[PDB]
Write a protein that binds this ligand. Structure first.
Ligand SMILES: *[C@@H]1O[C@H](CO)[C@@H](O[C@@H]2O[C@H](CO)[C@@H](O[C@@H]3O[C@H](CO)[C@@H](O)[C@H](O[C@@H]4O[C@H](CO[C@@H]5O[C@H](CO)[C@@H](O)[C@H](O)[C@@H]5O)[C@@H](O)[C@H](O)[C@@H]4O)[C@@H]3O)[C@H](O)[C@H]2NC(C)=O)[C@H](O)[C@H]1NC(C)=O
Ligand SMILES: *[C@@H]1O[C@H](CO)[C@@H](O[C@@H]2O[C@H](CO)[C@@H](O)[C@H](O)[C@H]2NC(C)=O)[C@H](O)[C@H]1NC(C)=O
Ligand SMILES: *[C@@H]1O[C@H](CO)[C@@H](O[C@@H]2O[C@H](CO)[C@@H](O)[C@H](O)[C@H]2NC(C)=O)[C@H](O)[C@H]1NC(C)=O
Ligand SMILES: *[C@@H]1O[C@H](CO)[C@@H](O)[C@H](O)[C@H]1NC(C)=O
Ligand SMILES: *[C@@H]1O[C@H](CO)[C@@H](O)[C@H](O)[C@H]1NC(C)=O
Length: 154
């Protein structure tokens, strides 16, 4: 039921995707998304110490040199607190997921079509199929180097 999305490395994409490439990171968790978007004041303000426990998840913000915790805190604030109620379960889930991603079903979400390699370079992916964005029709996909015929590797 919850969408799990992550960034993939790409030198061609400015931001976390280039940062991940430069650092040899292939997958960095974006979020775990239930249907409900949290609006208003969080039940608990997430601490950098609590967020840094999501080992492997690089921050999407340059203002922390793609480390922690703007994006991590964004996730807690936007999709976290109103669905999990307490930071502990959320931290434990976010962490296990990132770890699974770090340690090796992945559908493309957004591509950057590279003309020099005739490839749909996957910049964001998820655990379920989704309408693609910026993916050229009929071209192969590159999921952090892995070449796949379809938009999903399953
Ligand atoms: C998909 O996404 C949904 C969210 O939309 C998610 O569902 C949520 O799952 C979390 C757990 O992962 C669950 O959170 C618990 O909620 C209950 C109340 O509903 C709380 O009691 C829990 O907190 C736990 O208890 C502590 C305090 O409580 C007391 O203290 C003692 C401690 O000695 C405990 O043993 C007892 O529980 C006692 O009552 C808390 O302080 C701790 O944090 C502790 O974990 C959790 O907060 C939510 O209810 C679910 N919400 C919904 C909407 O479903 C689901 O897991 C996701 N699934 C997947 C597969 O991704
Ligand atoms: C992390 O990876 C493990 C191993 O692939 C997942 O565990 C399996 O999950 C399936 C489906 O949920 C279960 O039926 C199996 O019994 C589990 N096997 C093992 C060896 O653990 C786990 O679900 C993954 N967790 C996350 C959050 O991605
Ligand atoms: C977060 O996940 C990591 C894996 O990415 C877990 O790492 C372990 O850290 C503790 C020491 O702090 C030990 O169990 C091992 O040295 C680590 N194991 C591995 C495989 O790296 C960590 O347990 C997780 N933390 C939380 C809070 O879930
Ligand atoms: C990565 O991109 C930068 C800027 O576009 C470029 O100068 C560099 O040569 C690229 N490196 C690789 C290995 O593609
Ligand atoms: C950003 O991080 C990388 C690797 O951790 C490092 O090369 C760089 O110097 C860091 N700091 C700044 C300010 O760029």
């Amino acid at each position: 039921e919850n969408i799990t999305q992550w960034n993939l490395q790409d030198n061609g994409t400015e931001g976390i995707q280039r940062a991940m490439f430069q650092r040899g990171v292939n997958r960095s968790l974006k979020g775990i998304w239930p249907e409900k978007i949290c609006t208003g004041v969080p039940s608990h303000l997430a601490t950098d110490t609590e967020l840094k426990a999501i080992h492997g998840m690089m921050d999407a913000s340059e203002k922390t040199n793609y480390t922690c915790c703007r994006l991590q805190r964004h996730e807690w604030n936007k999709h976290g607190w109103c669905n999990w109620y307490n930071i502990e379960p959320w931290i434990l889930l976010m962490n296990k997921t990132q770890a699974n991603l770090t340690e090796g079903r992945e559908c493309a979400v957004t591509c950057r079509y590279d003309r020099d390699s005739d490839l749909n370079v996957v910049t964001q992916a998820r655990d379920s199929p989704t309408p693609l964005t910026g993916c050229k029709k009929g071209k192969n996909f590159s999921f952090a180097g892995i070449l796949v015929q379809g938009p999903c590797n399953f």
